[PDB]
Design a protein around this ligand. Structure first.
Ligand code: SF4
Ligand code: SF4
Ligand code: FES
Ligand SMILES: [Zn+2]
Lengths: 114, 688, 123, 71, 84, 38, 208
């Protein structure tokens, strides 16, 4: 498709990029974990980062892989600074929300027709 | 080559020699406003709200009835037309009293969506307004005749399609009423369908009478199953409940018309209904138990029985997706001996190739047909839209009719040929005439029902009638192919419940004593507990409680026809999928999801979960149930014409009779009808 | 200029949540409410989703609900451009078909007839 | 089940009821054919609507108005 | 057990499948003139690979195919399972 | 007539705070099972 | 007709025919359509290429000043096959007129910032990145304005069901103010207002 790409060209400089800002996240999880005075096992903070970057795996295209970045490149602005107050962060790890069954026969006794 | 060009608003368009202005000016996308003109009816001239203005002639014509000659300039929008359509619709607001707060059509009416857009602004009268008086017809049509813009669209309809000729025009001058001179109540099928016709709020529906106004509802298309032709309906939902249902204007089945029974029967849907599972208890005790509890109660009891001792029979309106999950499950324990509640006599066919098993020439075939002979049925009260799809074609062009047995009241001039099974045979050669008339017929047709086919000699009449179809078809027999012999059912879901391969007729249980049955039938008085052996248990499954709710072991709920995305079939073998509307009440659940949670808690676990993994299974076991609404070319009754001649059985002797005669039994029949409390109002206004 | 042609079937991911694969949308031509004869409510191919449970709220009887879509109707202009928006946003769907009447043949003045069977009285 | 909410709260309900308060009216008569039902005083009340009383004995009170009306 | 049932799927056109259509001309009236028990099923259209299907032994599905054959090739292809 | 005699107030709990309820008839009318006999 | 109907004025409609005739004359590499709104306003349909270019011509000249940028905005149309739209809106202080500049786009195709031409598209471009999702390259800054820090949906486009996907509520089980999926106390009734008969003949869509 003819439209100018954003940053990358095909898939390599692109997949050099996603490798890159990983470390900015990987090098800085914990400085926050003492800064907000939020308490968690610092390794959790390194599981989620690696839990997300493995999530969107099937992407076939440039200008998508550049699009996601422009989001991801942002967040390091807010989080590495303090523009969030504890409660824009911890929302990643959902503490309160009761589990979903996701199995079959556990559904059939609770809830209609999902 | 036979067409005219005529310029509508300065634009050329082609029109067949003899279409009116209105059918031309529709082709380019305009509505001349309409009051007395309507497609499916005839045409008369007495609204005078379509005045088109022709080019270069001082008079103003009317665009309902008048042909269109070599090209006029048909000028819709000028300063001449706009001098009329403003000057009529200030007349018919002279007397139209000050309802609309409360006139129950107050959200659709056509003294409203004309007379803002087209026509006037304020009024100059200033004093007047006759008010006549109403009366009553029946416990459906509610009648305030104070309104009546007097299109005369309710009258040309009685003498037209539904053949009952009653309504009339009584009077002269400013005063003429409409309703009937004497006190006769006017009651029939399809004549509960008027209240689509009347363009203003004269005729408005009784049970619905005051509940909701029609900007609030939600139109979710659906399909009506109480009967063969199906429909295309549309439901409505206010708060999450059903309010009222319409037709959906399909172009073959339900021209614009929906029958009456399928309309006023939503009412027993929310009345008496079973909202939970109910355990067994040993006594007359029957109680409610948690959904996990009475599931296993019947789970283990399957690990006991085996072989033909466990057989299920489902004869009712059940879907075509709970006719697999139940078939594959009870057939993976290898116990079948299963049938439906219905009775289809079989000899050398009745499943294979089907060819005789469904109505061959579709509904849309009748329009072309020439000679018709139908036997052993009263087509009026079963498939009421196959009747008047004769009537309209009996008129509008010539058609001939003959019936066999028990002359009933139909709407058109037929003739009773003879009454007995023994008449059919002598018509093989010349006797008891037609003799050549079926023979000389260009497109003969023959229709056998499910009432006559259900006798104990049944496999004979199937084979006796097929002969006369072979008799003719082997000559030419039509032109041409033009299939002839065909059947019509009266039962909701059968052609699905059968051509899946479920053997016809309840016999296979009648020979032996199987211990554990599943009743989806379920309310026929066929199988009782007395007929069963000892108390070994039957598990009822279904939504209602009618008969077979008490006589049963453990029951399980279900969703009706408005709550589930299912697949039905009508008697041309289409596939129509009803669509979700309300979500089912209390604890009840869908049927084919109550199978798989019967399976996994027991031994075998069927190979699917979601819906699309049901229909792929529907796709293996049958190819055409996933082809929605297409009639594929099949004849294939040659090879079954001979093979069903195998058995030599001969008839009984006894005059044919239909179950339904004149009316009163039309209402309470299937399930929902029986519990519908408004039918309970119009059954006692019949007897007396 | 960096024109860089390629072909990857357009899809988009992550913005909604689980409602990507759970549901089935539907593309259908509205049917004309039949209590009135106005033919102008047709002509646009919309889409609307499946309906999930509305229950009762045990204080008043407002029927409160989840299923946060439940009320959207987009309006497209045609079929070729209809399916265009289900794939490009990546969820399942289904299709209906448009309907228009027979031609048809209606002539006043055939209502008074010598041997014809169509002859009206009290029209 | 539901009934534990207004415990001690005294449960406001409507002392009068109009379910039928109507029938106490001295159902009027005219001596003519059709009438003007504008109620409750001029230009406060239902829109003017004319009703026909010719039956034998009945009337018709227009249904906005409710007030039993006849000859 | 088996077997139990036999489902001959076919297509209305794409004549490459015509053997089945021809098979009915050839062996149906004759083939099922015996076996007055088995309920052979003709259903309509798989449009492609008119797979013959058969079911037995507690509902296990066994699907042979056919794509372009002659008349008698299938007549002998049926007794493959039917003898068993 | 059709209007009061004395008066009332807006009170916080009087004891009577009126605490509204639902004004409607029932909905689906569940089924009754059959009695003592088999 | 006079008393209640808005009296028209012709002069304003003659010139804005001319002065807009020839900005399809001197920049034909870009401008692909132009017209005159019956109320005496102009709409210039421009390819997405010229954005910085065309304005820059509109930025200064002695025959067209258009120094004052008033309103940048957007519209998002499905079944336009290129979703969104831009509309620039510019007032020329000397000549007393309004001329609007329409430029289409998609989500994926970037558009180039106008920021060096006017410094008042600084905010109006930060916003749109939040709402519709259009991505403006080479912008001195790109961030999140008008929206919270959680909205991953880009609302104002036509796929966001009005109530967003997560209601908020505070619970004392710990400290925080946390987010649970949206559960309403009333349906948000959907009424249906669209009446038949096509009251407008002039706008009559093609016959087809
Ligand atoms: S009936 Fe038709 S006209 Fe009479 S009030 Fe209701 S809408 Fe207005
Ligand atoms: S019903 Fe109302 S409209 Fe239909 S004909 Fe009788 S009066 Fe004229
Ligand atoms: S519409 Fe003109 S005659 Fe009825
Ligand atoms: Zn009154």
């Amino acid at each position: 498709t003819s439209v100018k790409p954003i940053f990358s060209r095909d898939m390599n400089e692109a997949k050099r990029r996603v490798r890159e800002l990983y470390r900015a996240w990987y090098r800085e999880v914990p400085n926050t974990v003492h800064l907000f005075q939020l308490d968690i096992s610092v390794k959790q903070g390194r599981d989620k980062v690696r839990e997300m970057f493995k999530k969107n795996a099937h992407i076939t295209d440039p200008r998508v892989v550049d699009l996601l970045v422009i989001k991801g490149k942002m967040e390091l602005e807010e989080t590495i600074k303090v523009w969030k107050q504890r409660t824009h962060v911890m929302r990643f790890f959902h503490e309160t929300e009761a589990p979903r069954p996701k199995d079959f026969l556990s559904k059939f006794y609770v809830g209609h027709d999902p | 080559s036979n067409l005219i060009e005529v310029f509508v608003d300065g634009q050329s368009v082609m029109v067949e020699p003899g279409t009116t202005v209105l059918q031309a000016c529709e082709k380019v996308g305009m509505q001349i406003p309409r009051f007395c003109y309507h497609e499916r009816l005839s045409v008369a001239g007495n609204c005078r709200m379509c005045l088109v203005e022709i080019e270069k002639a001082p008079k103003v014509v009317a665009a309902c009835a008048m042909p269109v000659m070599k090209g006029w300039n048909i000028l819709t929008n000028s300063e001449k037309t706009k001098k009329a359509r403003e000057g009529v619709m200030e007349f018919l607001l002279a007397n139209h009293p000050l309802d609309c707060p409360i006139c129950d059509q107050g959200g659709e009416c056509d003294l409203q969506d004309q007379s803002m857009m087209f026509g006037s602004d304020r009024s100059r009268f200033l004093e007047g307004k006759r008010a006549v008086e109403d009366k009553n017809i029946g416990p459906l049509v509610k009648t305030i005749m104070t309104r009546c813009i007097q299109c005369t669209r309710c009258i040309r309809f009685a003498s037209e399609i539904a053949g009952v000729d009653d309504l009339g025009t009584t009077g002269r001058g400013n005063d003429m009423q409409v309703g009937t001179y004497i006190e006769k109540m006017f009651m029939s099928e399809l004549s509960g369908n008027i209240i689509d016709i009347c363009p203003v709020g004269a005729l408005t529906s009784k049970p619905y009478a005051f509940t909701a106004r029609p900007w609030e509802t939600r139109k979710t298309e659906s399909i009506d199953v109480m009967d063969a032709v199906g429909s295309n309906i549309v439901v409505s939902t206010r708060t999450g409940e059903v309010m009222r249902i319409l037709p959906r204007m399909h172009e073959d089945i339900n021209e614009e018309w929906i029958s009456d029974k399928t309309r006023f029967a939503y009412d027993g849907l929310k009345r008496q209904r079973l909202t939970e599972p109910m355990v067994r208890n040993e006594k007359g005790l029957l109680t409610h138990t948690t959904w996990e509890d009475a599931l296993s109660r019947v789970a283990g009891m399957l690990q006991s029985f085996q072989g033909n001792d466990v057989a299920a029979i489902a004869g009712g309106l059940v879907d075509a997706e709970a006719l697999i999950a139940l078939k594959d499950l009870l057939n993976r324990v290898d116990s079948d001996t299963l049938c439906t509640e219905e009775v289809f006599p079989t000899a050398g066919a009745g499943t294979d190739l089907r060819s005789n098993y469904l109505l061959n020439t579709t509904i849309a075939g009748v329009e072309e047909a020439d000679v018709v002979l139908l036997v052993g049925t009263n087509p009026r009260f079963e498939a009421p839209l196959f009747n008047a799809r004769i009537r309209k074609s009996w008129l509008h062009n010539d058609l001939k009719v003959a019936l066999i047995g028990s002359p009933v009241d139909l709407t058109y001039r037929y003739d009773h040929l003879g009454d007995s099974p023994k008449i059919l045979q002598d018509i093989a050669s010349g006797s008891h005439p037609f003799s050549q008339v079926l023979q000389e017929a260009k497109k003969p047709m023959v229709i056998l029902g499910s009432s006559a086919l259900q006798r104990n000699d049944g496999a004979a009449i199937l084979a006796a009638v097929s002969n006369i179809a072979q008799k003719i078809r082997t000559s030419s027999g039509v032109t041409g192919d033009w299939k002839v012999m065909n059947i019509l059912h009266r039962i909701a879901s059968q052609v699905a419940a059968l051509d899946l391969g479920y053997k016809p007729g309840v016999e296979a249980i009648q020979k032996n004593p199987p211990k554990m049955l599943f009743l989806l039938g379920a309310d026929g008085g066929c199988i009782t507990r007395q007929d069963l052996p000892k108390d070994c248990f039957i598990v009822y499954q279904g939504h209602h409680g009618d008969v077979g709710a008490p006589i049963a072991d453990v029951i399980l709920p279900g969703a009706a026809y408005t709550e589930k995305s299912a697949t039905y079939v009508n008697t041309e073998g289409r596939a129509q999928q009803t669509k979700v509307a309300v979500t089912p009440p209390g604890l009840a659940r869908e049927d084919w999801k109550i199978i798989r949670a019967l399976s996994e808690i027991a031994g075998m676990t069927l190979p699917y979960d979601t819906l699309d993994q049901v229909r792929n299974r529907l796709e293996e076991v049958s190819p055409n149930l996933v082809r929605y609404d297409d009639v594929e070319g099949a004849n294939y009754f040659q090879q079954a014409s001979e093979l069903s001649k195998l058995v030599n059985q001969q008839l009984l002797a006894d005059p044919l009779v239909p179950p339904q005669l004149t009316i009163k039994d039309f209402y309470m029949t299937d399930s929902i009808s029986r519990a519908s409390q408004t039918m309970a109002k119009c059954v006692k206004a019949v007897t007396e | 200029i960096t024109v860089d042609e390629k072909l990857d079937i357009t899809t988009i991911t992550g913005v909604p949540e689980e409602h990507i694969k759970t549901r089935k949308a539907r593309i259908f031509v509205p049917a004309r409410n039949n209590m009135q004869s106005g033919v102008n409510n047709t002509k646009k191919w919309k889409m609307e989703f499946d309906t999930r449970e509305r229950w009762e709220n045990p204080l008043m009887g407002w029927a409160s609900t989840a299923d946060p879509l439940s009320n959207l109707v987009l309006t497209f202009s045609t079929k070729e451009d209809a399916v265009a928006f289900a794939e490009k946003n990546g969820w399942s769907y289904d299709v209906e078909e448009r309907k228009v009447p027979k031609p048809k043949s209606k002539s006043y003045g055939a209502n008074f007839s010598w041997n014809k069977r169509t002859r009206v009285s009290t029209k | 089940y539901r009934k534990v909410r207004f415990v001690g709260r005294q449960k406001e309900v409507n002392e009068n009821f109009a379910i039928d308060l109507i029938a106490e009216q001295p159902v009027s008569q005219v001596g003519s054919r059709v009438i003007s039902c504008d109620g409750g005083g001029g230009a406060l009340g239902h829109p003017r609507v004319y009703i026909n009383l010719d039956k034998e004995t009945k009337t018709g009170t227009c249904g906005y108005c409710g007030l039993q009306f006849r000859q | 057990l088996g077997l139990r049932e036999i489902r001959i799927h076919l297509c209305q056109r794409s004549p490459g499948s015509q053997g089945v259509r021809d098979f009915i001309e050839k062996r149906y009236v004759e083939l099922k003139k015996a076996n007055p028990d088995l309920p052979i099923l003709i259903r309509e259209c798989s449009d492609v690979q008119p797979k013959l299907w058969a079911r037995y032994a507690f509902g296990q599905e066994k699907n042979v195919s056919l794509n372009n054959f002659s008349a008698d090739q299938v007549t002998r292809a049926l007794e493959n399972v039917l003898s068993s | 007539k059709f209007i009061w005699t004395n008066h009332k107030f807006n009170l916080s709990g009087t004891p009577q705070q009126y605490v509204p309820y639902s004004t409607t008839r029932k909905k689906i009318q569940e089924w009754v099972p059959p009695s003592t006999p088999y | 007709t006079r008393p209640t109907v808005r009296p028209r004025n012709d002069v304003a409609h003659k010139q804005l025919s001319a002065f807009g005739e020839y900005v399809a004359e001197i920049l034909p590499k870009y401008v692909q359509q132009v017209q005159v709104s019956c109320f005496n306003e102009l709409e210039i349909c421009i390819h997405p290429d010229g954005v910085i270019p065309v304005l820059t011509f509109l930025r200064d000249h002695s025959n067209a000043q258009f120094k004052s940028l008033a309103d940048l905005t957007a519209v998002d149309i499905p079944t336009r096959q290129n979703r969104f739209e831009i509309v620039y809106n510019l007032l020329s202080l000397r000549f007393n007129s309004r001329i609007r500049v329409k430029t289409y786009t998609d989500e994926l195709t970037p558009i180039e910032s106008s920021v060096p031409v006017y410094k008042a598209a600084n905010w109006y471009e930060r916003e749109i990145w939040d709402m519709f999702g259009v991505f403006f390259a080479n912008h001195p800054d790109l961030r999140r304005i008008l929206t919270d820090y959680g909205f991953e949906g880009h609302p104002f486009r036509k796929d966001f069901p009005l109530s967003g996907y997560v209601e908020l509520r505070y619970d004392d089980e710990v400290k925080r103010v946390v987010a649970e999926p949206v559960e309403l106390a009333q349906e948000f009734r959907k009424f249906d207002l669209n009446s038949p008969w096509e009251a407008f003949p002039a706008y009559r869509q093609p016959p087809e």
